[PDB]
Amino acid sequence: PAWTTFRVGLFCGIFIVLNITLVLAAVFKLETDRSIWPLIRIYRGGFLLIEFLFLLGINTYGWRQAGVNHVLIFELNPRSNLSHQHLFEIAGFLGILWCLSLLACFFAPISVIPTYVYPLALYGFMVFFLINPTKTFYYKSRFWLLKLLFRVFTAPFHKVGFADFWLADQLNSLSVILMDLEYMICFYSLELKWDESGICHKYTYGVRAIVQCIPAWLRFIQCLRRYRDTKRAFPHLVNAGKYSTTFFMVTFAALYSTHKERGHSDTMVFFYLWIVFYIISSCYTLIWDLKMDWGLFDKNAGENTFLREEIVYPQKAYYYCAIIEDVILLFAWTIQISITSTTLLPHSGDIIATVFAPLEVFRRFVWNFFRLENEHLNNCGEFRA
Amino acid sequence: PAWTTFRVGLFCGIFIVLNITLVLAAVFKLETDRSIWPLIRIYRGGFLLIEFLFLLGINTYGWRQAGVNHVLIFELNPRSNLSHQHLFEIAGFLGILWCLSLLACFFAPISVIPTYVYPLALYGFMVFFLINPTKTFYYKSRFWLLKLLFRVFTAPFHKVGFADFWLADQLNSLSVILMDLEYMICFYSLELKWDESGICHKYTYGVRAIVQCIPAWLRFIQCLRRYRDTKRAFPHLVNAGKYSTTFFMVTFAALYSTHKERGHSDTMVFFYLWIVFYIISSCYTLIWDLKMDWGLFDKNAGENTFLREEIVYPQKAYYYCAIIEDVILLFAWTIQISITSTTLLPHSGDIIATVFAPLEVFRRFVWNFFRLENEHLNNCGEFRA
Numbered sequence A, B: 001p002a003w004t005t006f007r008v009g010l011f012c013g014i015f016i017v018l019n020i021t022l023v024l025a026a027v028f029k030l031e032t033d034r035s036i037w038p039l040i041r042i043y044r045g046g047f048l049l050i051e052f053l054f055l056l057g058i059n060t061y062g063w064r065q066a067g068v069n070h071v072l073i074f075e076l077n078p079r080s081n082l083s084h085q086h087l088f089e090i091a092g093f094l095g096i097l098w099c100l101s102l103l104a105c106f107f108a109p110i111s112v113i114p115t116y117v118y119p120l121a122l123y124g125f126m127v128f129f130l131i132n133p134t135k136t137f138y139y140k141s142r143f144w145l146l147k148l149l150f151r152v153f154t155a156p157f158h159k160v161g162f163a164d165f166w167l168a169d170q171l172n173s174l175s176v177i178l179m180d181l182e183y184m185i186c187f188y189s190l191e192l193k194w195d196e197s198g199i200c201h202k203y204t205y206g207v208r209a210i211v212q213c214i215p216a217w218l219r220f221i222q223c224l225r226r227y228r229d230t231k232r233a234f235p236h237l238v239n240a241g242k243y244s245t246t247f248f249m250v251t252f253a254a255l256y257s258t259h260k261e262r263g264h265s266d267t268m269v270f271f272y273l274w275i276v277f278y279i280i281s282s283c284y285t286l287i288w289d290l291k292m293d294w295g296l297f298d299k300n301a302g303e304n305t306f307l308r309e310e311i312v313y314p315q316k317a318y319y320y321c322a323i324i325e326d327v328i329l330l331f332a333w334t335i336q337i338s339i340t341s342t343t344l345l346p347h348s349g350d351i352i353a354t355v356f357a358p359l360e361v362f363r364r365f366v367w368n369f370f371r372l373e374n375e376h377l378n379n380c381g382e383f384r385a
Helices: A003-028 A037-066 A084-106 A117-131 A139-153 A162-173 A175-189 A207-229 A234-262 A267-291 A317-329 A333-340 A349-378 B003-028 B037-066 B084-106 B117-131 B139-153 B162-173 B175-189 B207-229 B234-262 B267-291 B317-329 B333-340 B349-378
Strands: none
Touching (some): A003 B003, A037 A175, A084 A117, A117 A139, A117 A175, A139 A162, A139 A207, A162 A175, A162 A207, A175 A207, A175 A349, A207 A234, A234 A267, A333 A349, B003 B084, B037 B117, B037 B349, B117 B175, B139 B162, B162 B349, B207 B234, B234 B267, B267 B317, B267 B333, B333 B349
């Protein structure tokens, strides 16, 4: 309508200037004799979520304009849809809340409450806005999201729809948010509660491995449930392998990290095995994305050199840019592991992680941007008809 | 359209949060051993202009919705109109520039330029955005405004249209902006130009009197030109009297102020004469506004107790609220003069002036809100047909 567009404008404006204020306050008012990592490590989750919602708004716009309809694919209702302006405004609202909480963490405005209650309040509100039992604030769509989250987190007990698969895949890309939330739990359980601001931050007690692999587990058991429902082995078990490689990569990385902390002689072999398993996982997921989840590299593409037989997005350069971006964004782990194992600053692993997490969300953006199109065109996953 | 509404939202959001930041920086970072008056006295002009443009946007909305059409009255073009969202976004843009300049005056961001260049740059841009000789930034409407300003400031040489009269009246209400601009000229001509930040601020050399009465002069000579064009004495010379009273009030206030500064014995008589002349001016303009410029208090109003015979604005309470607001806003000078002449803080006259100038702009808001309606209904001024 019109009021929705005006609210998109209001929230986007407040957000851009809050970001300017936040950058300025971070460059200037950053004495911070204490360590600042227990703050950005807790706010990385909110940041990844807000960036993901912005990019999902852009995805919905691209779908609706290019021609690929997501009202039938997603099993939504042909009317009472959710345009992209709605996603933009709700992401902007969560961004306003994120920036306000972060500013309250920078300047301590109120002198009676400690500065550790602002992340707690921000995430408590982000949860209450989603479990809101009233008849307001996107009642229908938000409760559809709740039904979807309940049917995807209890995966091997329900029939696989396209929304289930799609949200399981999104959660498989946003693993840093789950790591963030479990880290916030661990911290607020294991930190002094007097005036300011370790066991976790490391893979010591294995909770990091479980939390990082739980979306891979979701998608793995989901595709196994689909293979039990139907009877076909090509796009089900070859798909389960892609998420078994994530299991193995996380396990070996955890063992290597704990052995490097303990300094045992079993560190180099586990490091090499982590290297080779992330290599096979990245090659696997790259081939899969370029072959099935996108349908590219078709056998009879005609004048289109490396594409399908037909296309929806007008500029053919978009697809080549997407191929390059998906082979660069994925495989960016090499820079990470090299710069962390070539004698850099002590606190640099988290620098690289925070730098490359929004880049991973961008990769998931592009992947959606093309997967919904391929699903509308070729019906890759046998979800309908 | 839609992009215009989104830009209204963007600018309104940036503006509200810039206002919050500005209020906070004014309450907290206000050491300011020096006097702060040469800053708010220079920014009051921009503030009154931005508030006036917001309220003119609201006026255009009220006109277009209530039914009173301003496309024929204002001699504009029935197509290529200017909706209220355009006024809102351009006022928001000037507000963004105002808030940015004021913040740059609070925090000195750049260390090489003195803090007196920001008001100069703000108003230089406000003038360049209006004299812009390109084919962009509201080319047609802005050059219509230039033609109107040139035909109204050279009043006694052109035929009086409704736009001429209306802008002369608006300028007759926004006299504080002209006082502000002449004061900025005087200051930047009579202030040290080394690192920071009197003859004016007072009515000493009479420039304040001339500047404060020049819109009254505009409207007076304009109604005299109209009386020469037509031949009718009721709504022309009785109208010229209303702006002759402003001449007399300003003259007597200037004489009283200069004699109080010089402490002569002629101060009390001039103060009493200023009192009585502002009394007669306020009663005159109140009776005129309630009788002719609004058409209220009709002789045959029917069931409507104190109104016209017909009305356009639905809630009848709006009109009574407007009568009360126009008899309160006008006549607010009594509080000013009493609190300034009953032994209050030295710097309090400018406090009261800055407090009551936006209130005067609000009075002009309501006056327009009803005058355009009465003009569409009864054709009070013989402007058409």
